[PDB]
Amino acid sequence: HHHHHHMVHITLDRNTANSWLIISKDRRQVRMGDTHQNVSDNKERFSNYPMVLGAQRFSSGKMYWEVDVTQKEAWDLGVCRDSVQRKGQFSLSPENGFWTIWLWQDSYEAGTSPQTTLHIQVPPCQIGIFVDYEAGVVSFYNITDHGSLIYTFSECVFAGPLRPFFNVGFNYSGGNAAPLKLCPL
Ligand SMILES: CC[C@H](NC)c1ccncc1
Incomplete structure (x- = not known):
């Protein structure tokens, strides 16, 4: 592909994170903690799953970024609507406002329904x-x-x-502790 020139600098939004996530000081890495990370609850936080959003919002144009998934056994990646459900159980699907792929149990799948x-x-x-x-x-x-x-x-x-x-x-x-990392441009 030749999409590299639309590269955007993504940072993670702490306020949207599940309360067990640990986001690095530079807001470019995130991993699962072994406990609650001592933050207050808010209506933005994903409650049921170890999810977080980027801070950036896109409503036009072409955007490109890269994520490091080294040594992970399970993860989801993509984009979603700003208005997706945060609380309770839900599936990742375009009908629910998600455009994602994932790794799970040694197979890769796209989040269609x-x-x-x-x-x-x-x-x-x-x-x-x-x-x-x-x-x-x-x-x-x-x-x-x-x-x-x-x-x-x-x-x-x-x-x-x-x-x-x-x-x-x-x-x-015990094999999925590694972080997701936003890779440098
Ligand atoms: C508290 C149940 C579960 N422990 C792995 C959990 C669910 C949602 N967020 C963080 C952790």
Whole structure:
């Protein structure tokens, strides 16, 4: 791909984080803590899952960023509407305002309803995410495999401002403690 020139500097929004997440001082890394991180509750925080949003809101244009997923067993990545549900149980789907892919139990899937199997020959250590607001496109790229396409959501109905979306996943196994990291431009 040739989307690198639309690179944007993403930072994480502490106020949206699940209360067990630990965000680095530079707001570029996030990981699951082993306990509640001693923050007050608020209506923005994702309650049920280890999720957090980027601070940036996008309503036009072309945007690109990259995320490091090295040594993780489970995670979700993509974009979502600013108005997505924060509290309780929900599925990641375009009907609920999410355009995402994930790793779970040694398989990669796109967050369609129902979910779509991905075909990845080279497990990615870094993911590139491209959003074209006007075109209604969200695309995912395998940076480890020379930028190869993973998945394209097209005919997207964003229906509002978009925010970068992250889920570090649970760590029931003891093998999923590693952070998500926003990679340098
Ligand atoms: C408290 C249940 C669960 N422990 C892994 C949990 C659920 C949601 N956020 C953080 C942690």
